Structure 1
Amino acid sequence: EDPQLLVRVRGGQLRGIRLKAPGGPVSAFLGIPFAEPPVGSRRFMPPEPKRPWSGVLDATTFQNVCYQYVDTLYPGFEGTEMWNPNRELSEDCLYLNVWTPYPRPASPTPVLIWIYGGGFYSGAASLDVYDGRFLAQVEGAVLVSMNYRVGTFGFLALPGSREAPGNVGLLDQRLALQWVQENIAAFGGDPMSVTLFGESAGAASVGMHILSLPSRSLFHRAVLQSGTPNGPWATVSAGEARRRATLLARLVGCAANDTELIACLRTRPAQDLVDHEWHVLPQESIFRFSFVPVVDGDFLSDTPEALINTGDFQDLQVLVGVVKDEGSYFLVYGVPGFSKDNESLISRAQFLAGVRIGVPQASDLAAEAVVLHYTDWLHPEDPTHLRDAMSAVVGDHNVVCPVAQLAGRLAAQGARVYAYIFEHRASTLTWPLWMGVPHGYEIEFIFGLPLDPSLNYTTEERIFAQRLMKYWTNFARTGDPNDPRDSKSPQWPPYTTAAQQYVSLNLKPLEVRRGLRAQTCAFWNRFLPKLLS
């Protein structure tokens, strides 16, 4: 056997596998169990630390994907499949993955911990897009990724009940966080330098760890990509959670006590739960998800907004960002007149129709406010503008403005913030051009995929991917994405409340801009709330 592939952790012995990255080998350990399989009566329950094992456990292969809805809108299409599960579905999914350089680091390496997205209803650490070999190999990072329970299995809550207190998916993450503290040293990783990063639902979990005291001792830095704990989609109230749980239970046939109800749910095949997962939304919406974290006054003392509005972030360091076209991706998923197979030019009417969807909570008047604000009064009926507007609304509503809000809140309250906007459209992107740089297409670059010679990316992009892996790791190492030996380019300045500087991430060297949709986000973050209050 190969010594560089045998590791003893607190629970037993593991055998990793030696993988070939373009530039050299890396040691990988996949399918590492961090919890007792939360199946049977353990459904909806917090996770328990995994029992010790005998012999040498094989950790050379990806474990199962947590049970979730699978998308089927464009069957066999790379643009959607790249996010679908690539291993069997199982409730038995509590496993993590560690990549490290080969030979494993000589001195304690900073740790990256990735948390996936998928709107709290899908996702997996086995996705090719999340391949950790490149960062480990090129930047010599130790990189960790866990599976956590999504959808009903991870976030169905009957608040205040003992048998379904909610947030267990986030507990699954918190427990892998712990695992890394107890075990990562063995792989050469530095438990004293752990950066979390994540996108979409993932960025919000990161945020929620920032905001939950029990977690603030498991990491030292965060990166939130295209997602926040605050905002319209990442949390529900206890009353809203209770509502959906109860509704679902009704939907599969379970009207009495908390204990009785959940008991019956526990006796239901996975696909039954997923079969109705979607039917419990309060409105015909987009960028809305059925089972998400709940404000329980436990994991979350209060709402993320209350929490960011008054937290003390004296000792925090954070990288926050969006892409150029946060909204596009979502429109093809049920917004009348949109499709990836035509340029989706819309009429004024469909534009109105579509606003009541991307802002499901909006009053009649609140919606009119949006429409008037995003209409280009020079070309109020121009089909291209109307389409592009629809995207902007949805992206600004759900991502850009919430992010602007968090940055502003953090910076103002002591935190050290770096903000980007990601502006480069993949050469091999399979979505139409009208969607621009969609939600989730910075990831491949951060993870270093363009170095995969066979992915047919251009050289410019290979160079670009390398530049980001640096930023991200320099951040992990130092809390500052700036090369301490660079050099080009103009240096990435911290986001502040006074100047509000962020940078564009594109093929050209860094350019500094001021104000993250300042005027438009003022409208979302400052005025609209009055309009509904």
Structure 2
Amino acid sequence: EGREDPQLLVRVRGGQLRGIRLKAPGGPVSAFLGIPFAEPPVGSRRFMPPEPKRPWSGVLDATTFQNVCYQYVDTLYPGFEGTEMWNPNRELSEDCLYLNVWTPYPRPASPTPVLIWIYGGGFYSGAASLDVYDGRFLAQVEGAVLVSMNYRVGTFGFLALPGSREAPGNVGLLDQRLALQWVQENIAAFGGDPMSVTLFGESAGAASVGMHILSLPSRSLFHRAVLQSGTPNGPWATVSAGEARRRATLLARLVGCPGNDTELIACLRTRPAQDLVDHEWHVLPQESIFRFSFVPVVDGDFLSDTPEALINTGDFQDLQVLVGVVKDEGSAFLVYGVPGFSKDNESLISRAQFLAGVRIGVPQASDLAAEAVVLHYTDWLHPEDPTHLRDAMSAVVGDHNVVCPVAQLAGRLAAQGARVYAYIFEHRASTLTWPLWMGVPHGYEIEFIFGLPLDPSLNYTTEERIFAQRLMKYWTNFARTGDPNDPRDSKSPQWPPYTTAAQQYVSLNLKPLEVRRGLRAQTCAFWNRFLPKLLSA
């Protein structure tokens, strides 16, 4: 042990770890990468809840990111930064249950607020080791302890035969919960305050954060939550038990597996990981965007009822949440199989291409409901205009899947006692490689929250760097105090809480905070109040 940095040896419940001193623009940070938190969910453990990592002897090397959970690697535009940056940057393995910790260097003398990141990727992809989730900046600049975990995705994480012992569903959420217990027991060793833990996440990550809010055992493992561009309620983040059974069964069938649940699961198990991935998209009931095959299941266990029912009837008195959306939630989804759309042209579509796109975006919808969406999203002054049709298509997808589900999460937590803060993120990164027409696409605020623009080698404007500092300040102020506003700062414009009466939220851009009212109030009344009833009859 004798000749290495004394500031990088830490013990956890499972044994000794050696971390790595990393360089950040302002100075050094401690990182402890690839800490096993669960027994490898391999072999007979596939589809099964995670078991706590057994203790090891000797010093575990925690200097590098560990394997990414098995997943479909995106190949829409091979070589393209815009898609590759989300693709796994470590080898794929079922042995993937590891978490990462960044802390100031030297580690803080007094108990520090902890941020826990949960990545998105439609519950079928993603990794805590992606460049855009690098905790070094928040660690260094804000003095925060940042934890991020891998969790199982796709079949391995969410395939369920509800009611069975061998494949209960929701195990990917259980991986996340186990990483949270790991933080409770171990984060004090790194100088984190386990009594001050904020979850934050984007997309499926946000939806996950939301499910932890709505699940009893998880509630005791954190104090605050941030949901970025995603919600537990909504059309994509969950499935009924019935539907999850249908999908598991169909996939079983597609890989050559037959009648009860034990035999079926044993057979799946058995199957090479790649075979499962290769067939997962085939189980979707309709041609669709923003829908994913294997997602959290309403099991009557982890989720005791539908997220809708739980937000309508829950008590959220002691909760504080920060929630928000980006300007162009839907645009990215269009290039993934809406005919008409491409990254390499303006995507000026036709009316036919729009009606076709609406069916794909609202899958789900009877002929009448589709007519409603179309009528509501058509500009009747220019009903044939390709620019507007392209933007309406984007908005349809963005509104239905993200903006409007966020609109109620907020309105609904607020009506039941939560302190809520809402934002629209409106800045397009100067470094962004998607075309202009896509505006500010799903996921493109994360790099700012994590303070990447502070890395001078990244070529961000000045400007964008000051902006990244502001957001980091809002987020860690929220983590620290349940309120993004600067306590001492007299002059800087206030971020008011979202309420049902005033419906206030802020724009996050290069200009100072501007308070707007109503989150697409008029349009979200369509998706949240009218469409459901139209779908009944």
Short-chain TM bin: over 0.9
CA deviation map 1:103-157 (0-9, x unaligned) = 0011000000000000000000000000000000000000000000000000000
Shift of 1:379: 0.8
1:3 CA drift (Å): 1.4
Following the alignment from structure 2 to structure 1, what is the Cα–Cα distance between the partners of residues 7 and 198? 25
Distance (Å, rounded) in 2 between the aligned partners of 1:364 and 1:383: 23
> Which runs of structure 2 are paired with 1:31-50 in the superposition (5 Å)?
31-50=34-53
Q: Give the Cα–Cα distance (whole angstroms) in 1 for the partners of residues 18 and 110 of structure 2.
A: 21
* 1:489 to partner: Cα distance: 2.6
Q: Deviations over 1:314-357 (max 9, x none)?
A: 10000000000000000001101000000000111101000000
Question: Take 1:486 and 1:323, find their aligned partners in 2: how far apart are those partners?
Answer: 26
Shift of 1:196: 0.1
Residues 189-232 of structure 1: CA distance to partner in whole angstroms, max 9, x if unpaired?
Answer: 00000000000000000000000000010000000000000000
- Specify the alignment match of 1:172 in structure 2: 175
TM-score (norm 1): 1.00
Give CA-to-partner distance per residue, 1:276-329, whole Å, 9 cap, x none: 000000000000000000000000000000000110001000000000000000
Cα offsets for 1:244-286 (capped at 9, x unmatched): 0000000001031100000000001110000100000000000
Match of 1:252 in 2: 255
Q: Which whole-Å CA distance do the structure 2 matches of 1:422 and 1:333 have between them?
A: 23
Per the alignment, residue 285 of structure 2 pairs with: 282
- 1:523 paired residue number: 526
Counterpart selection for 1:414 from 413, 417, 422: 417
Give RMSD over aligned pairs: 0.5
For 1:380 and 1:8, the matched residues in 2 are separated by 65
Please state how far the C-alpha of 1:485 moved relative to its aligned partner.
1.6
SS of 1:228's equivalent in the other structure is: coil
Shift of 1:488: 3.8
Name the CA distance, whole Å, in 2 between partners of 1:251 and 1:507. Answer: 50
Distance 1:207 1:437 in 2: 23
By how many angstroms is 1:177 displaced? 0.1
Q: Which 4+ stretches in 1 moved above 3 angstroms? A: none
Structure 1, residues 165-201: CA drift from partner, whole Å, max 9, x if none? 0000000000000000000000000000000000000
Indicate the residue corresponding to 1:78 in structure 2: 81
User: How far apart, in 2, do the equivalents of 1:382 and 1:271 lie?
Assistant: 44
* 2:360 alignment counterpart: 357
**After superposition, where does 1:375-390 map in structure 2 within 5 Å?**
375-390=378-393
- d(CA) in 1 for partners of 2:49 and 2:360? 34
| Residue 54 (1) aligns with residue 44 (2) | no
Pick closer, same or farther for the CA change 1:488–1:385 going to 2, 3 Å.
farther
- Give the superposition deviation at 1:501: 0.1
User: Please, which runs of 5 or more residues in structure 1 have no aligned partner?
Assistant: none
**C-alpha distance in 1 between matches for 2:8 and 2:116:** 20
Alignment partner of 2:226: what SS? strand
Distance 2:140 2:109 in 1: 14
Pick which of 454-463 and 488-497 moved more: 488-497
| Greater mean alpha carbon deviation, residues 278-287 or residues 482-491 | 482-491
Q: Please, which moves more after superposition, 485-494 or 375-384? A: 485-494
Query: For the residues of structure 1 that align with 2:491 and 2:446, how far apart are their CA atoms?
Result: 23
Candidates 374, 379, 389, aligned match of 2:377:
374
Deviation at residue 487 of structure 1 after TM alignment: 3.2
Alignment of 1:137-148 (within 5 A): 137-148=140-151
Which stretch shifts more, 479-488 or 84-93?
Answer: 479-488
CA apart distance, 1:242: 0.3
Give identity over the alignment, percent. Answer: 99
**2:447 aligned residue:** 444
CA distance, structure 1, for counterparts of residue 75 and residue 85 of structure 2: 12
* Matched position secondary structure for 2:268: helix
Q: Distance in 2 between matches of 1:455 and 1:323?
A: 22
Match of 1:6 in 2: 9
Cα distance in 1, alignment partners of residues 499 and 10 from structure 2: 44
Deviations 1:373-409 (A, max 9, x none): 0101111111100000000000000000000010000
Query: How far 1:486 moved relative to its partner?
Result: 1.4
The Cα of 1:492 is off from its aligned counterpart by: 0.1
State TM-score, norm by structure 2: 0.99
SS at match of 1:346: coil
Secondary structure at 1:365 match in 2: helix
Distance 2:31 2:491 in 1: 34
Q: Provide the rounded CA distance (Å) in 1 between the counterparts of 2:258 and 2:37.
A: 36
1:238-387 equivalent positions in 2, closer than 5 A: 238-387=241-390
Query: Secondary structure of 2:95's partner?
Result: coil
Query: Does the C-alpha gap of structure 1 residues 488 and 441 become closer, same or farther in structure 2, counting only changes over 3 Å?
Result: farther
How many pairs align? 533
